[PDB]
Design a protein around this nucleic acid. Structure first.
Lengths: 99, 68, 140, 70, 140, 136, 190
RNA sequence: GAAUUGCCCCCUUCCGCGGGUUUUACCCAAGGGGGGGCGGUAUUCGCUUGUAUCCUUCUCUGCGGGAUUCCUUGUUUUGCGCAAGGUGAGAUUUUGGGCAACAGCAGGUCUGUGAUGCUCCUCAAUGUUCUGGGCGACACGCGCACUACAAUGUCAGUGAGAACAAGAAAAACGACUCUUGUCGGACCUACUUGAUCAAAAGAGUGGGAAAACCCCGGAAUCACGUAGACCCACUUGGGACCGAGUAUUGCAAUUAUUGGUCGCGCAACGAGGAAUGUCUCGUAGGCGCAGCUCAUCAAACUGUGCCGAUUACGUCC
């Protein structure tokens, strides 16, 4: 492995606060940053009939979720990673998968 | 076979009973100013029409409504 | 390596290797004449004889895209499952022959399982398609 | 009797090598119009006239083949 | 000296490259352009070279990589990629004069050079068997 | 010289079709049997039916249909394998297609097993549905 | 060059080419492309579908029905053989034939309905140029399809037969009958 | 480093002479001379064939750019606008969706719900019953609705070879071994073997929690200068029914569950009456794949892609 921080979320304008600002700490602030960035957004798509009984003209609804995914890289910091990560914990339903 | 032509100088109306046909206004070109004198006539035509197109007539002395 | 994708690579470039594979026999042409890998028939098993054009492909292709082996190869098999029981239609392919072919090509063709191709027999029989056939007459 | 035939025969190969190479357009089909032989063995038949150059070719084709006079 | 370009048609994107060898000739994929088995498609891909002279404007060496649609669409993609390349190479390594000339001959012809083509395909919808067919049922 | 017209291969008339396997279909007999022409001692294809009992002789073919366990021995290729009144059989007929069949029918009829009940009434005996098709 | 000005069907020449009728001169195009396969978008506006080369109005006009149909590429390949037949038959360039066989393939007068009263009454009504073109294409192609169903065995041939028997004025073709009957109706509904 | 080891030159110009020339001018054949291209800092080829260096055209994605403008001075009333052309990636609701007022129907649903009023039933129950067996949209002269496959020679049918698509799908279930509070396996798929002899099956190993594995996603339609078979016949067109053998799924496949090869085809059906369905451009039609349901089985439904037209762009009958 290397140090790979991934960020996943259910909406945009959530990810951007975490990534695109508040990984500031590793950016130009103290140490090197190699920044790759963002990945295929996936769609989770659940088609569902609209009538609670059997009648009608056979209408439907389609519902959707969006996933959002991000990814950034650091070249062996030796427990500066503690600092860098911990400052943004922010926004409900953003999760942070550090490797 | 005798095939007389003529030019579509303008259009008049689109007049049919389902839009099937259309009226148009013809300048004969077999007009010689003397034993053919027609000036401008009108005929019924069929399918899409546009000014400056030419059409083919094997008959003349029939107007596009008559008295019938 | 250059196998399949050199000069032509239609029928012309397969006929010459088949011709080669005969003559000096160096390759198994195992019993089982009865075997249908592309299906659908109510008629005799293969008209042009299945074994005859089958052999070249399973070194050619395998050294073109390199380490395409066993179940990879069935993908360029064909079929519709044309007669079905007033059902629609599918793809299908029967895989087995590829394995016994690649064994009967392991005398000349495949260098190893791990890497593939010798000095390329068909880089040679390929290069005489510009030049010579085995005959020329009226409609070639 | 035989609307179309399988036969190798006298009159087959006779009529072939006289009437056929004279014709301006030659197809395997039109020999079957003479109520004589198929459009099957016709094809192959023509190919050994064309070898001996009684007739000439116009297109290399598959199923669609034709020939002309030499 | 190089340039790169892309032609496109439907989903299929085809990339391309132009480099100078001025006694050498054009291929697509690995197969050379004279050998590309459907006759009609073969014709089409040549019309980027027959329009705009011969080897007079283009004895350069060109190779393309087509990805992502079936045979027909691959053809049209190719044409665009070739022609784009020719143009672009002229712009960079030569004057604006002779460049503009090439353009006039393309656009004249029925190719219409920048035929990028916005048509794709519109979606299946819930009340239909795809995009304006609906369903059939009795007693309307 | 002389062409075919109404040959026999069972004392049963057989068209002189100009490819060999397709004539034999009449004898029942179907395409993915015949292609044993290799082992049948006339290896011919692309050859008329009319050339019989010459040096592409008739009883060659005929014998290989009678006993196919000496011209090569695979099953999965035989009408009846593992008979349920004898140990094993090969079976390639007529004449016994309308006898052997009929006997299976009769057997089931007797002891009244379900397959045999349904077939006396002429109803479908496999999976099958009725009440919309088949309608006579 | 021998490329830049030359445009040929596969060797057949557009260089000296005429339409015998002034009526359908501008509604029968002049081909100037190699092969009869092209994009679309000529049905995107009311008149643009007669600025398209005539060999495509043949190719596309021969594909109808499902059966397993291979559509475009298929059609082209048959047209090729057809033209070849024509050339050695009448000893004339193919393209010229076609561009005449069109013109005579379709009536100049027609019969339609002004009637009412629960019954019809029909007058004689002339036919615009655009019609005559399209009608001719149609009926020739139809004659082929029918003729080739189980009669002959030939795969192009009866195509060529319609075209040739059209251009000369013969009643052996499909189209020329159609024309005759339609005018023997129209002109006598007056 | 490895491999093939070969192409089954061109342009421009001047002069001469013999023909064709009406003297002449003009023109064709043949030949010679001069000028200019040119093998350019390049024979060609490796998604396992490896060293070094550099880049972001093609990919991915969040937030943003991107036209009733311009002209025809046409048409129109100066107005609202309209038609043709131009500009352009795109030209008029740019294209396809989702959303959608007021007033209602005694439409459907008490078989969606710890959504329910009043009633019925309650210990030999109309409850519970994951209990054993049967029945269920399944049982068979017959009518009707929707679907799929055909009557073949416009790929048309059994055989062969070539190229080639994108949305999408998979991960946790108290048992197990780990220490002191947690690893692995129950889901996909590759390769290899089985295969010194059918399919279907069997077995061992490895990867992937998904833009890493499967995957360079080798779809089918399709293409063929493949000298392929076939030949107009209910035929090798179509299969419906029907018998035998075998393996897998599952606690249980008998009323055949699903595959997979032999026989049955001599069972229908040869373009279809009255009548009738919905469609205007990447559309109609043809063709295939995935998701859905879920031990097992899709001619259905939902979604994505490929091949891709004819006619009209009008009226009120």
């Amino acid at each position: 492995q290397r140090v790979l921080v991934k960020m996943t979320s259910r909406n945009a304008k959530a990810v951007e606060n975490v990534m695109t600002e508040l990984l500031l700490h590793a950016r130009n602030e103290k140490v090197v940053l190699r920044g790759p960035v963002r990945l295929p957004t996936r769609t989770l798509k659940v088609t569902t009939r609209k009538t609670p009984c059997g009648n009608g003209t056979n209408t439907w609804d389609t519902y959707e979720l969006k996933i959002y995914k991000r990814l950034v890289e650091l070249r062996a910091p030796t427990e500066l990673v503690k600092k860098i990560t911990s400052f943004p914990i922010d926004a409900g339903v953003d999760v942070a998968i550090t490797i | 076979d005798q095939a007389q032509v003529g030019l579509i100088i303008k259009v008049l109306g689109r007049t049919g009973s389902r839009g099937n046909v259309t009226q148009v206004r013809v300048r004969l070109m077999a007009e010689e100013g003397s034993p053919d004198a027609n000036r401008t006539i009108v005929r019924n035509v069929k399918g899409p029409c546009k000014e400056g197109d030419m059409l083919s007539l094997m008959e003349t002395e029939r107007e596009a409504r008559r008295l019938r | 390596i250059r196998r399949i994708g050199k000069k032509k690579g239609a029928t012309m470039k397969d006929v010459h290797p088949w011709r080669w594979v005969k003559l000096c026999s160096q390759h198994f042409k195992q019993e089982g004449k009865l075997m249908v890998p592309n299906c659908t028939e109510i008629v005799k098993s293969s008209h042009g004889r299945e074994r005859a054009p089958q052999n070249p492909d399973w070194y050619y292709i395998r050294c073109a895209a390199i380490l395409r082996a066993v179940y990879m190869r069935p993908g360029v098999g064909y079929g519709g499952l044309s007669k079905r029981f007033s059902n629609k239609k599918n793809r299908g392919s029967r895989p087995e022959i590829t394995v016994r072919a690649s064994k009967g090509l392991l005398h000349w063709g495949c260098k190893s399982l791990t890497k593939l191709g010798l000095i390329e027999k068909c880089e040679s029989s390929g290069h005489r398609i510009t030049k010579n056939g085995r005959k020329l007459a009226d409609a070639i | 009797a035989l609307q179309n035939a399988v036969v190798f025969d006298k009159e087959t190969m006779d009529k072939l090598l006289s009437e056929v190479p004279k014709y301006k357009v030659i197809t395997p089909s039109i020999i079957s119009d003479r109520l004589k032989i198929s459009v099957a063995l016709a094809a192959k038949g023509l190919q050994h006239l064309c070898r001996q150059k009684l007739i000439k070719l116009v297109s290399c084709s598959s199923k669609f083949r034709l020939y002309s006079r030499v | 000296k190089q340039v790169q370009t892309f032609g496109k048609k439907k989903t299929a994107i085809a990339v391309a490259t132009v480099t100078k060898a001025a006694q050498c000739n054009i291929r697509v994929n690995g197969v050379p352009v004279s050998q590309i088995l459907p006759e009609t498609l073969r014709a089409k891909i040549m019309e980027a070279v027959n329009v705009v002279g011969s080897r007079h404007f283009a004895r350069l060496r060109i190779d393309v990589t087509v990805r992502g649609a079936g045979q027909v669409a691959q053809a049209y993609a190719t044409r665009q990629a070739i022609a784009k390349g020719l143009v672009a190479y002229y712009q960079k390594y030569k004057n604006e004069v002779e460049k503009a000339a090439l353009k006039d001959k393309y656009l004249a012809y029925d190719k219409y050079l920048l035929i990028a083509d916005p048509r794709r395909c519109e979606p299946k919808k819930w009340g239909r068997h795809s995009a304006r067919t609906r369903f059939t049922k009795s007693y309307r | 010289e002389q062409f075919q017209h109404i040959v026999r291969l069972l004392n049963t008339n057989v068209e002189g079709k100009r490819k060999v396997p397709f004539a034999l279909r009449m004898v029942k007999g179907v395409g993915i049997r015949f292609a044993y022409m290799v082992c049948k001692k006339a290896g011919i294809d692309v050859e008329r039916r009319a050339g019989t009992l010459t040096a592409e002789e008739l009883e060659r073919i005929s014998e290989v249909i009678a006993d196919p366990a000496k011209f090569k021995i695979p099953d999965w290729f035989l009408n009846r394998q593992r008979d349920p009144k004898t140990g094993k059989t090969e079976h390639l007929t007529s004449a016994m297609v309308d006898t052997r069949l009929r006997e299976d029918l009769e057997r089931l009829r007797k002891n009244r097993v379900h397959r045999g009940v349904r077939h006396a009434y002429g109803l479908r005996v496999r999976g099958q549905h009725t009440c919309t098709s088949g309608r006579h | 060059m021998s490329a830049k000005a030359p445009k040929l069907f596969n060797k057949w020449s557009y260089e000296n080419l005429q339409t015998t009728e002034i009526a359908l001169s501008d509604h029968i195009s002049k081909t100037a492309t190699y092969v009869p396969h092209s994009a679309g978008r000529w049905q995107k506006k009311r008149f643009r579908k007669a600025r398209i080369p005539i060999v495509e109005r043949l190719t596309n006009g021969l594909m109808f029905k499902g059966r397993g149909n291979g559509k475009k590429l298929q059609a082209v390949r048959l047209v090729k053989h057809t033209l070849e037949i024509i050339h050695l038959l009448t000893d004339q360039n193919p393209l010229q034939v076609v561009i005449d066989a069109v013109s005579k393939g379709a009536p100049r007068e027609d019969s339609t309905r002004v009637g009412s009263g629960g019954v019809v009454r029909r007058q004689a009504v002339d036919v615009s140029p655009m019609r005559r073109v399209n009608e001719a294409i149609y009926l020739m192609c139809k004659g082929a399809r029918e003729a080739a169903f189980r009669n002959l065995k030939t795969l192009p041939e009866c195509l060529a037969d319609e075209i040739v028997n059209a251009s000369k004025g013969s009643s052996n073709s499909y189209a020329i009958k159609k024309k005759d009957e339609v005018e023997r109706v129209a002109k006598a509904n007056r």
